[PDB]
Amino acid sequence: GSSGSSGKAKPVATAPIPGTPWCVVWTGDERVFFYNPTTRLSMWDRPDDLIGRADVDKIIQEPPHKKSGPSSG
């Protein structure tokens, strides 16, 4: 009677979203999800709680793991 560890992959970078308790988390599969260390909630898509805010987007647009010394570039 269990579902299982949602998704099978470890994150690469994590950053707390401003204003919202959500935290942008990137992965190795050139992806990114939203986590909530306050409500132990972890989704795969952008929840409404964030829908509307620009910050949430900006973060996803320009990830930290990338800047600050690019690997490929």
UniProtKB/Swiss-Prot annotation:
Name by which UniProt lists this protein: Transcription elongation regulator 1
Location of the WW domain = 16-49
Upper classification of the organism: Eukaryota, Metazoa, Chordata, Craniata, Vertebrata
What is the documented function of this protein? Transcription factor that binds RNA polymerase II and inhibits the elongation of transcripts from target promoters. Regulates transcription elongation in a TATA box-dependent manner. Necessary for TAT-dependent activation of the human immunodeficiency virus type 1 (HIV-1) promoter.
Task: Give compartment(s).
Answer: Nucleus
* Source species, domain of life: Eukaryota
The free-text domain remark for this protein reads: The FF domains bind the phosphorylated C-terminus of the largest subunit of RNA polymerase II, probably mediate interaction with HTATSF1 and preferentially bind peptides with the consensus sequence [DE](2-5)-[FWY]-[DE](2-5). The WW domains bind Pro-rich domains.
**Organism, as annotated:** Homo sapiens
**Tissue expression as described in the entry:** Detected in brain neurons.
Give the induction note: Up-regulated in brain tissue from patients with Huntington disease.
Question: What quaternary structure, including any partners, is listed in this protein's UniProt entry?
Answer: Binds formin. Interacts (via the second WW domain) with TREX1 (via proline-rich region). Binds RNA polymerase II, HD and SF1.
